[PDB]
């Protein structure tokens, strides 16, 4: 119910929504004759 819960979720959720797509668009685990004897 405290107001500091609201703006923290908005600030970090902007980081989450930006950086979850960073985990999604880039896959970290993506691994790219006959001689004389």
């Amino acid at each position: 119910k405290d107001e500091n819960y609201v703006n923290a979720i908005m600030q970090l959720g902007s980081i989450m929504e930006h950086c979850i797509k960073q985990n999604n668009a880039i896959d970290i685990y993506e691994e790219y004759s006959a001689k004389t004897i």
Binding site: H18, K21, Q22, A25, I26, I28, E31, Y32
Partner: protein
């Protein structure tokens, strides 16, 4: 013992240089298009450049068929007396700062293509007539296969190479065209690059007997060729003389049809990805001509007043294509909107700078323009440039058929 770790961070040092800016262009061009009626804009995205190819011309561009962010760039020298080495570089949108894979060739790279089934194999032709097959899985800079004089090669520069379906023995196949008039099918059998001469180009009407008894028959220099989407044997040859030879794979001696396309060198001939009958031609004649394969006459004529380096069909709809010219201007046309003028014409480079090649990303709405000094620029099409109207390829076929029939009704009456 750090090979696993260093490979992880090398791929993934390129995160904040991708997705701080990949989701940027997803919603960066949503501006000023509700106020502009029918004219689009090209949005300046990132610039790709390497120091090893500063004085070399971008001569071929091809997106990876599997990856929406990886593309391969080849570097050559269109200047005939300033020939030099040729670079093969692959850039990812994840790493705009540094290319993902570096390759080098002795002769100037003038053509490349990526296999659709095997995105790790690229066939690259050069100025000396050698075609080479590079493997991306191998970290070595050498191609897996490479033609030579003993294995068969062109005596003239290779201008286009295109991958093809596997042959009658299930071996990888690709075709090449060159200035020696030889269209050669190259087959990937085990560890060899076998060459098969399919079509030898000859010029008609100029077989003159010099008055002591020898006939040097004229050999039409080949510049551009593309295969038909549905018909397997159908393909076209864009020639130096301004002619388009409609040809078949099974007829090595007779062309199916000949179109007097242009009057200087036809740089690019490509088929429509939706309509099976529509192909297009561009040349240095400053005119951009659209054709049907059943009709001799060009359906559309677009004089761009500058030498059109390259054209490419867009794969989201069949009525829009792009053209780049030597004056630095990129031209966007839409036949359903403007049958006579470009809907967008923005100078993406300087007047001194000559544009060479252009292509579209398959999924993301961003284009790439090549250059004669090695520059690569990414550009997102505006929502005006990707405006959508039922869905399907037959819808795009019927949309272009109405445009075809109307211009057919134009030429019947007018």
């Amino acid at each position: 013992k750090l090979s696993q770790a260093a490979k992880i961070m090398e791929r993934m040092v390129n995160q904040n240089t991708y997705d701080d800016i990949a989701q940027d262009f997803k919603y960066y061009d949503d501006a000023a298009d509700e106020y502009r009626d029918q004219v689009g804009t090209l949005l300046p995205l990132w610039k790709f450049q390497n120091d090893k190819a500063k004085r070399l011309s971008v001569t071929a561009l091809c997106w990876n068929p599997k990856y929406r962010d990886l593309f391969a760039v080849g570097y050559g020298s269109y200047d005939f007396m300033k020939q030099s080495r040729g670079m093969l570089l692959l850039y990812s949108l994840k790493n705009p700062s540094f290319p993902e894979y570096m390759f080098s060739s002795n002769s100037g790279v003038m053509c490349l293509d990526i296999h659709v089934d095997h995105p790790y194999l690229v066939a690259v032709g050069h100025y000396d007539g050698n075609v080479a097959i590079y493997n991306l899985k191998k970290p070595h800079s050498q191609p897996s296969f490479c033609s030579s004089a003993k294995s068969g090669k062109h005596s003239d520069p290779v201008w286009q190479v295109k991958w093809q379906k596997d042959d009658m023995d299930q071996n990888l196949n690709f075709f090449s065209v060159s200035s020696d008039g030889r269209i050669v099918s190259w087959t990937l059998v085990k560890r060899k690059l076998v060459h098969i001469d399919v079509i030898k180009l000859k010029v008609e009407g100029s077989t003159t007997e010099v008055p002591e008894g020898l006939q040097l028959h004229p050999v039409g220099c080949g510049t551009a060729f593309d295969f038909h989407k549905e018909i397997d044997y159908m393909f076209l040859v864009g020639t130096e003389e301004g002619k388009i030879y409609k040809c078949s794979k099974s007829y090595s001696s007779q062309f199916l049809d000949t179109y007097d396309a242009h009057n200087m060198s036809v740089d690019t001939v490509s088929w429509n990805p939706y309509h099976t009958k529509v192909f297009m031609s561009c040349s240095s004649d400053w005119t951009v001509k659209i054709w049907d394969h059943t009709i001799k006459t060009p359906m559309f004529i677009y004089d761009l007043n500058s030498a059109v380096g390259d054209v490419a069909w867009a794969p989201y709809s069949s009525t829009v294509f792009a053209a780049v010219t030597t004056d630095g201007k990129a031209h966007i046309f839409d036949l359903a909107i403007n049958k006579y003028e470009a809907i967008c014409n923005q100078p993406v480079a300087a007047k001194k700078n000559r544009l060479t090649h252009v292509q579209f990303n398959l999924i993301h709405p961003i284009i790439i323009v090549g250059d004669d000094r090695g520059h690569i620029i990414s550009l997102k099409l505006s929502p005006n440039l990707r405006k959508m109207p039922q869905k399907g390829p037959a819808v795009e076929i019927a949309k272009l058929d109405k445009l075809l029939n109307l211009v057919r009704e134009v030429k019947i009456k007018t």
